[PDB]
Amino acid sequence: ATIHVDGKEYEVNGADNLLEACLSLGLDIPYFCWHPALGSVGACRQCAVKQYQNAEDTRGRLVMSCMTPASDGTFISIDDEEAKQFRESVVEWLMTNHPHDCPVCEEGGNCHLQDMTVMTGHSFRRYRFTKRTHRNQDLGPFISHEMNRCIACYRCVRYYKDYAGGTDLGVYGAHDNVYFGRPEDGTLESEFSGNLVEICPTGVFTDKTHSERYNRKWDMQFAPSICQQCSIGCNISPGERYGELRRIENRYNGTVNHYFLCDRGRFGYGYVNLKDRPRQPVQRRGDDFITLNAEQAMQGAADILRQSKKVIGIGSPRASVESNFALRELVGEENFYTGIAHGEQERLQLALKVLREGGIYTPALREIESYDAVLVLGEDVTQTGARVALAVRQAVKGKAREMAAAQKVADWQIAAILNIGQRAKHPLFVTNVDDTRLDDIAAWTYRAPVEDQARLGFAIAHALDNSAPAVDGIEPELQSKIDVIVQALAGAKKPLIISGTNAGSLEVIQAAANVAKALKGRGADVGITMIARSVNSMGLGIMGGGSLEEALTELETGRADAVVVLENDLHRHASATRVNAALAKAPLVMVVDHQRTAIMENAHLVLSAASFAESDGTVINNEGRAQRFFQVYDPAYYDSKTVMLESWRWLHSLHSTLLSREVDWTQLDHVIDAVVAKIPELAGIKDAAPDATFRIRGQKLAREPHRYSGRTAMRANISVHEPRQPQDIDTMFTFSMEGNNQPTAHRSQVPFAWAPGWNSPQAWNKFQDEVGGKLRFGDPGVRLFETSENGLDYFTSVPARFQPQDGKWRIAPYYHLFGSDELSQRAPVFQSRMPQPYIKLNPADAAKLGVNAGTRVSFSYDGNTVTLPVEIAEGLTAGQVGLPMGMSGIAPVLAGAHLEDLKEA
Amino acid sequence: EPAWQTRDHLDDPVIGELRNRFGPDAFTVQATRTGVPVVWIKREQLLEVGDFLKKLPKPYVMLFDLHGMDERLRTHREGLPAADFSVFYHLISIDRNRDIMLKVALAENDLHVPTFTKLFPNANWYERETWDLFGITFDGHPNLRRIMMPQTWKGHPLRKDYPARATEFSPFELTKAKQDLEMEALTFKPEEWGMKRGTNEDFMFLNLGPNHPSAHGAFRIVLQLDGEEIVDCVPDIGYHHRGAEKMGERQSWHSYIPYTDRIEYLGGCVNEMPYVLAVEKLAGITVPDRVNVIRVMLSELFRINSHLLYISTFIQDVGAMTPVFFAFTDRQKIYDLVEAITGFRMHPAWFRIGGVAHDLPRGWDRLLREFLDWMPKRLASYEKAALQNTILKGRSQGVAAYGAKEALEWGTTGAGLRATGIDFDVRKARPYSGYENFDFEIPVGGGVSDCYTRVMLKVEELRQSLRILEQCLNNMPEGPFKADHPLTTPPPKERTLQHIETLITHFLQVSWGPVMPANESFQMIEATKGINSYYLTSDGSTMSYRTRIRTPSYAHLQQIPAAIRGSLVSDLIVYLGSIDFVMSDVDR
Amino acid sequence: TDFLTEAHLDLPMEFESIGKAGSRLGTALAMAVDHEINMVSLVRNLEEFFARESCGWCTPCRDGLPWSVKILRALERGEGQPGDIETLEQLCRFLGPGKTFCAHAPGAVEPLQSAIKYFREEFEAGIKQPFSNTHLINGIQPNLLK
């Protein structure tokens, strides 16, 4: 298409509206109610341009650019005098009732309304009457509510209801008393409610966790990082002030997590700011806890390790690829152990084998939204991989999108699309042990034990392709549901099969692989998605190693007299009594970690490792994409006594001191080169981000905005002499504003989005090639493996049906977005959001045991009696008991295990 | 059409003359808000274009400015040639009352330009500074050494990849530089500085710095002497380099104003004026008449302050130690008025983008009237007591004389230029800030620029500034002290305190900065010591992409060896006292 | 619909005839206003109805009809200030067809603009007070715009 804006000719996409076409060309049109992810509604009337009928036209007509297609041969004017007057008048109308609140508003300096008020040139007030006011609501611990600042742009309700699928937010009232909020006070129930603080262009919805320790956007130190709270790998911009992690913003990645995070990634960062974190290396001598610097710790650890006969290392899926590799090189490949359990490791390696040997393409998170039918087997996606659940909701609304596209309705005309596709949606079939948060949009939900869900998957695969192994003993009603699923999957151009390791069943993953293979054999464009547990679960699976049980066996038998535990509390993957016994028997325990874990009581040495905010590294997400995260701030800038280094730096220096009795710390790219030289499967992590010599026309990449303040006063109470600016030898970023953050700079790692005149998250428009698309010079991150040329064989081992045995209770895993991830529990804001931990019981089993709802029952696992209250789970199958995985005292390894002597206390 | 409008200046006769001489395709005309024709010339045609402009019927006789720009980070380069770096040449024709800016584009690897020193001799120091701060080599230069940074300096500070901030202090580097300071008297080679015949077996060498007990600053001159005669002299400058242009790239448009104060630190609001006028050209702001009169009043008060200091220090340098006390009493009267209006004495930082910081306080006219009654009898007493002294005349008359051609070829402006009979004052030739509404004369000399002639011209300029101040006192317009433009930074304070849109504008203007659309602007004013100018390049951001400050003291200090060669050293001291320079103006 | 005078009373009740007269035929149920009714109070009542029956979707109707209502309330009580009629005319220009999401707000501003066109002496009679938007703040001299 060809458009003419203000006498200049441009080539645009004809499927776009005029607003996104002009914003992609670098033109500045003010807008409020339009969002790239939500479509156009034409509410705020801010995006007015003057459209002419032909080239020789003087009158024209004011039109909404967001509602007008950018068709070929269009003629418009942005800087027309009447259009400018109308846009200024719209801003003026919005300013009539706006409160005098910018100094005490958390959106100040990050406010889209401020930017568009300045952009239209409106600074003179002639309105002299009263301003309407509103009472606020309590929206929970994460979102602060202030309805005075609302401009009634309807973006919150559109995102929360139409996009996110939430139900407890709405618009109430009438003409100018429109109220946006909940029908009553209470916590916002959506797992993606935190994106309201970026969706809302004003300060109505704000980050309450940030508002506690508030600072302005210009005062932040930002870095591009990866969220560490599950395996999805959403790109984030952590921002720090005065030595503490202040905020997590969404960092745009057009391939992964484009505009949206989940609430666990946005508000679960509080463990970084915990006061009990180790800040110096501490050596235990008797009952004394002496504090060492880095060189003394390295020398003492090297001497004690050189005296030992066999030192083993226990990695973790929390740690980055470089730290796990450095531990593996320090202890040797034969002595390196992945810190996860044997069953967890088996499921993880099966998921990796399916992903990189099954011959079926695995989609990125943005690509999930383009699929035609979704079968979720075993994985409670909303509680373990939440952003995949949001993308699945978009893929489900794809049917209404296609139905509207059949009627020549443009993709940005979202109201017409939703009107045409009223309640029709793409098929979604979810299986779990109980109800899920995807059940409202699911075409069918199967509540069954993991063996029965695996059997349903195997039966679906057999019905799609008769070469697959058959399932014997299917009830005719379940057979009819299976035929419904098969007819929906076979008629789909792009089916998607989603499973993962969180179900605790190998057979569920095998069944999902069989369904994907059966759909691939029919010529479908099938995709498969495995949801792993932790941020670097896939990297630890690719690296490999022994299980935690083998390491504990080596410690208990005495063949190993030294253990180095890297960023692992060890209680989530093995029983606590066994771990404590094996660590108490070992004459040397060295724990390299950034969180105060329970195994440090038995540790002879504790190395104060850095968290993700104070470290650089690489993590591999659930789709196999290698992504680099960069250090946000120097921990030693304020507290000069803090010795908190990267885990790979600690382990590389320890290896150097063990070998040559000399301390060499490392450089990060040196460790990257060592990884890609020793482990060829991880060779793609070299291209995840450029090395430390990368420059933009000779200069580094700035971590903080140009107007960063207080540089001669932020540390002036400690000493009036300004300290040396922290050097970054590891990465291309600088710990200062003396760098480049231009939107046109040839790079993929963007620490934060700012452009002149665009201070809000709408500056990401300036950082994209086209608005709502990818980043201008490619999205960061590189897939480690391609789709295999040939696939796997059918998994023959179909499990038998679940049989409730007397005296044994099968543990059904219940995951919680606030409480199952290890480090996010440590965040103090999650305790008010984390549910009180009960145990789920069938009504039949609870009536058999004589227990009601709320009474306390006690059960023993591994010879340890613990007591919990009871809820009655109607959807849970009898013979099973439901437990909240990852909570305090309940390890995720308990999923799929059995329970004894469960009785009322 | 407003005065800040973007113009190509294709109606300038120099564009037609260049088109007729070199061809339509030989250059590219750039539309700017500088007010001058900006012409991009090929590098191989630069000397031909300069010669052609030098031999015009009303020729371009003065190289006003010469510097560089790092174009690598410049995003809005529409209508511009491909350039990693660029070198600009600002040339002034006084007979046409016109000026032209030639621009040469340079690739990153090929950073060399032919020298301009054969056409204009002030290009020597200008090209030395361009080499020092940008790394651009000038072929054929007689001595292309560093002029701001020391000789053992790594990198070029005005490049965009050079970090602006102060490095970590090291006592080892201080001790090493002390060792070079002590070994400079032993390892002095008289060829690196551009001299020849380094000891005819009688040419001694003298050093006059870098500890100068005077208000003009501290800088070294190494003198080649035949007895008492100065055979040759080169000045060593850069001892007061503050990186003010680099800070112009590191401060917002509003937060840079106090740095503009400290360029010529005896000037104050006079230094603020060209910066805020150039920013207002970038912003498209036309200030009201009351703003023009207020800024003119403060500029003339500070001009009288600077002239009083200059005359008193010259009289002190001659040998009469008494009038400086009374001159500083008059400076205290001026400072009483300036403290009342702006709250500060020497660096008021009171001008704003679109106006001034506050309205005039009630009762200012009483202080202005008291100073206007105080000044003339004191000025006449200074004249009769020291300026008509025949010993002072014998020390000053005929010392360091030059004519109109020598002043033109060295870029001399101010009283030194006008003492040669060339009537060129910016307040009349290129009027700004409503100076056309005032009745004042421009004193000119007979044709010779002595020390005494320059001093008497500055006395007459002081009297004319008193006349301007009297007109300012009698005719004060009633109106706003800030423009009604949306880019007026900051907005009026009461509307900020009670109106939300004004509060939003203030919030974003003082924090992120006002957003100037991408353009180039230029403002030239008659400062207290000559012609001062700000050349500002905006890339569309809240910070200046390039802030180029042309100061007259640089040109006068470069003119020194051409005017003092063959004189005595006491004559050199008198010449330094009569130049009216400060070293912050030279180095900046 | 737009107000019409007694000169337009000799016009046929067709869509095209009333359309060329600067009004609309509408529902063709005409309402007569006598000399006793103040035009400012009548337009205030009309705009109060139109502002309180806004659906709230789009900015010009939702946020500009209450401004016109408050201006007409001030003009009713004689508290009008200079620029109020100019604000009403600007609201007429910027609430026309194509500027709001639906046709409720053009129909809202049709009677206001017709009564301003035909009975401007009644609206100008409400402007008595000088325009004041700010109060004096002690210690800050105002920018005295002329």
Ligand code: SF4
């Ligand atoms: S929402 Fe924006 S305009 Fe409103 S008070 Fe907050 S910062 Fe100011």
Ligand code: SF4
């Ligand atoms: S609360 Fe925010 S997002 Fe919702 S309508 Fe109001 S301004 Fe828009």
Ligand code: SF4
């Ligand atoms: S979905 Fe996972 S990776 Fe993404 S923000 Fe949530 S916890 Fe972080």
Ligand code: SF4
């Ligand atoms: S003009 Fe229509 S769409 Fe707009 S707020 Fe008024 S009634 Fe609603």
Ligand code: FES
């Ligand atoms: S962005 Fe087009 S009307 Fe709101």
Ligand SMILES: [Ca+2]
């Ligand atoms: Ca680092």
